[PDB]
Design a protein around this ligand. Sequence first.
Ligand SMILES: [Mg+2]
Ligand SMILES: [Mg+2]
Ligand SMILES: [Mg+2]
Ligand SMILES: [Mg+2]
Ligand SMILES: [Mg+2]
Ligand SMILES: [Mg+2]
Ligand SMILES: [Mg+2]
Ligand SMILES: [Mg+2]
Ligand SMILES: [Mg+2]
Ligand SMILES: [Mg+2]
Ligand SMILES: [Mg+2]
Ligand SMILES: [Mg+2]
Ligand SMILES: [Mg+2]
Ligand SMILES: [Mg+2]
Ligand SMILES: [Mg+2]
Ligand SMILES: [Mg+2]
Lengths: 129, 6, 88
Amino acid sequence: SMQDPIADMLTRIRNGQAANKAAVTMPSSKLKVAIANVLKEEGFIEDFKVEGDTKPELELTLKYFQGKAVVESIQRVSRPGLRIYKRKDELPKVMAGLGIAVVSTSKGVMTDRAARQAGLGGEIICYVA
Amino acid sequence: KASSXA
Amino acid sequence: SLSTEATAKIVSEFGRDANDTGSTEVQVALLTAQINHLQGHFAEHKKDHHSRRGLLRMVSQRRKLLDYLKRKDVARYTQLIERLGLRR
RNA sequence: UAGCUAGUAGGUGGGGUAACGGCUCACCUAGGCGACGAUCCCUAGCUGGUCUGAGAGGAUGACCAGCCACACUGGAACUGA
RNA sequence: GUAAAGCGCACGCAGGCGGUUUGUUAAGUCAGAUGUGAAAUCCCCGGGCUCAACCUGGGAACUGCAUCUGAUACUGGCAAGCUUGAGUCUCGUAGAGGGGGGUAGAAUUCCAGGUGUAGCGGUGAAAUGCGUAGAGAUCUGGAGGAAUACCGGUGGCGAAGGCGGCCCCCUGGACGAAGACUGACGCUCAGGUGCGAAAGCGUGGGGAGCAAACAGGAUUAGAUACCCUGGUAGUCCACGCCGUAAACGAUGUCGACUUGGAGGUUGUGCCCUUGAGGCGUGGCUUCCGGAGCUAACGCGUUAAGUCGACCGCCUGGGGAGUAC
RNA sequence: CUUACCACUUUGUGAUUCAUGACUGGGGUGAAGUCGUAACAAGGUAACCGUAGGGGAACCUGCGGUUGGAUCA
Ligand SMILES: [Mg+2]
Ligand SMILES: [Mg+2]
Ligand SMILES: [Mg+2]
Ligand SMILES: [Mg+2]
Ligand SMILES: [Mg+2]
Ligand SMILES: [Mg+2]
Ligand SMILES: [Mg+2]
Ligand SMILES: [Mg+2]
Ligand SMILES: [Mg+2]
Ligand SMILES: [Mg+2]
Ligand SMILES: [Mg+2]
Ligand SMILES: [Mg+2]
Ligand SMILES: [Mg+2]
Ligand SMILES: [Mg+2]
Ligand SMILES: [Mg+2]
Ligand SMILES: [Mg+2]
C-alpha cells in the first residue's frame, strides 16, 4: 500500500514535468510543504498552493523553459526503507554545485548550501537538478 | 569418441 | 450469509446504538456468529474448500480486530472475549 | 548444527582471595541462555599496520612496536613483591 | 517475458515498512566542547649520510570511540485526535464459484425376437477379424455406464488448480448505489499452515465408450513404431494418499503517478425513457498504438513506463536439480 | 594415617570425521568404430512439460497441459 508520500510527491513532479503538465496536485502535509518551499525559494517551481479544509490539497505549478522542463531530474535519496543522514562537512553537492539537495535539520528544511552555511546537517530528503 | 584409438 | 434481522440484533447489542454498525466489538460478533453458524455447514460437506476459504478469512479478520482492540482498550478486550465466550 | 543449562540463574548466611564475585559450601527460590543464532561442528593468535584499490572495498597479520598464549606431552603446587 | 533468475496458489506469527494534526519525549539524527585514539608506518615541509635507498625534526593524519552541553526538521517512543487507506451495515446485479441430493434427452455397447441374404469391416492398397452355425443392414423390446450437442461467445465465475444438460437444498466471493458507522484497525511475509491438473498409490464399488500393457494383420532392409483388427490397468463413484506440470502472461504482492483508438461483459445516473437510441459514472476483460523503456523481439494506464514497501530468486556451459 | 578434589589409565556403548575396500552406479574427456536416425523444416507420426507402462538404443505409447507448432485444415 502507500508507504512514502515524499517519494510520491517527487515522482508526481517528475511525471508532471515529463507530461508537460501545467500543474500538479496531491494530498498535502506539513513536510510536503517545506519541500515546496525550498523548491520555490530555489526556483524549480512557480509556487505552492494549499486548498483544503479537512483534507489539505497541495498544488504545484511546474516551470518550463526553452522547450524543456525546469526540473531536469529529481530522485528520492533518503527512504523509509533506508534513511540517509549526513553531517555538515559531508553534505552532498548535486551537479558539482549547480543543483540542490534538500536536507531536514533541527533548524528546518533548507538547501544544502543553506545547511552548510548554517553549519549543520541532517536527513537529506532528495536531489533536484 | 572413439575410432582408431581416441 | 447472515440473516438481516439477526445481524441487526447483534448491531444493537454490542453497539453504542443501532446504526453503530461499524463498531469494533460489533464487527467481531457479526463474524463470530457467522463463524459459529458455518460450523455446521462444514459439519457435513467438508470437501467444500472454496467456501471454507471464506470461513478462514472471517477468522483471520476477526483475529486482526481483536488484536487491534487489545492494543487500544484492554478492558473492552477482556470483556469482549468473555462476552462471546472465546479466546480462552 | 535448534534447542542449551545442577553451582546451572538469583538469594541468604558461612568460608575464601590482594581484591569484587557460585570463587566455594549449606539452605531457600526456579530460574539463566537462544532465531539479534544459544548449543554443537570447522577453521584461527588480536592490533598498530602490510598489499591492492580512485574510493568503498578485497586480500593479509613475516620483518618493527603494543597485547595475549605456550616452553617434550598431561597435571600440581612450592619459593616469592 | 525470451539470455542464469518470480515460489503452482494463497492464508498468516516473527521481521521490515507505515496515512494525517497537535502536544510531549529527545532514543535515532545534527551541533559544540573536553578527554582519549602509544611510538613506528602512509602524507607534508625541512635536516643528515658524495646521491639514492636509508636515517631523522616538526607537522598533518589517525575519517574512530566515549563523555558533557545544546538543537528538535525528520525518525522513533508516549498522549490525544482526524478521515482520505482499511473495514462494518442497508438494498440490489451477473456468474460452468463450492458441497450434497434428484432428474432428463440424444448416442454408443450389449441381450432377446421379427424381416432379410451374401457379404460386412477395414486401408494408400491390403489383411487379421466378423458372416451360410445367417453377419452387416433393419424393426420392436430390454439391461447398463459414461458425457452433457445446439445455447457457446474475441463469454462468465474462481487465490490458483479449475468449474458447462436441467431442479432443489446448504454455501463462498465479487460489483454497484447511497449514505451511516469504526477511526490507521494497514502493506509485505523467512519460517508455518492450507489448497493444488493429469498420471499414480490404498480399500470397496462400478465398467458402456475410450485405451498404456498385450495379441494378431500390415509396412519396412528391420518396425519392439506410425497404420489395422482386438484389448487390460486406467478413465467413473466413495474415503484416504501423492504435491508435482510448458501449474505459462515462461511476467511476485500492494500503492501512487504518466497522451490516445477500437471491442467484450456486468452494474448504475440523466434526456418529451418518444420506439433503432443519447450522453455520463463504476467493475471486470480483450485488440491496437505514443511517449518512455528494451540487446533486440517487443511491452506500452491489465507496462516490460515513472516511483515506493516487503518477499522469493539468479551469478559461465556442463557435472546436477544429481549425490550425501 | 584417613577424607575431598584431581592427572595417566581402564570398561561398556554411541556419535562424528579422515583414509581405504572385492564389486558396483552413473558422469566427464578422448579426428573418421557398430546399431539404428530421435531432435532441427510440418524433420517426414508437430515438438515439448508432469506422470505411467513398455522396448538393444535413441525412444514408443496412454492421460492431461504448453505454443516455445508449419499449413486456405
Ligand atoms: Mg556469602
Ligand atoms: Mg561473608
Ligand atoms: Mg593455531
Ligand atoms: Mg568491491
Ligand atoms: Mg608441559
Ligand atoms: Mg609465599
Ligand atoms: Mg530462462
Ligand atoms: Mg505464479
Ligand atoms: Mg598513530
Ligand atoms: Mg515526533
Ligand atoms: Mg484406485
Ligand atoms: Mg517445478
Ligand atoms: Mg500493441
Ligand atoms: Mg534429487
Ligand atoms: Mg526425424
Ligand atoms: Mg516427428
